Amino acid sequence: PVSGSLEVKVNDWGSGAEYDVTLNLDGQYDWTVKVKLAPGATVGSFWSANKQEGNGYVIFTPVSWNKGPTATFGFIVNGPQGDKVEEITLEINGQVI
């Protein structure tokens, strides 16, 4: 199985919050990070990744040069006061790390 970890630095300012993510992987992968947004929250911008968004869910994948072993990317979420995100989960090969 693939080993690794996810870390994220959060800076919330009321109407929005910035999430700086760092993936500590045991190699290079075309990883996936799934983000469950809080009610009424939406992604305002992002970097170092491609984004797929649906009903309350966001999926981030790497741009060509950001496959690890230490990948970093980030995004800003706008929404109601309180935590803007409920879950941030790293998956590789369809399996949660």
CA distance 28 to 37: 27
Residue 64's identity, in one-letter code, is S
Q: Specify the resolution in Å.
A: 1.7
CATH, residue 6: 2.60.40.290
CA distances from 24 to 9, 56, 57, 79 (A): 14, 26, 23, 28
Cβ-proximal residues to 37 (8 Å cutoff; 6+ apart), any chain: 43, 56, 57, 58, 77, 79, 84, 85, 86
Discontinuities in the chain (C→N > 2.5 Å), after residue: none
Domains: count for the chain: 1
CA distance 22 to 67: 11
Q: With beta carbons less than 8 A apart as the criterion, state whether 86 and 35 touch.
A: no
* Method by which this entry was solved: X-ray
Domain extent for 31: 1-97
Tokens read off for 26:
């045991």
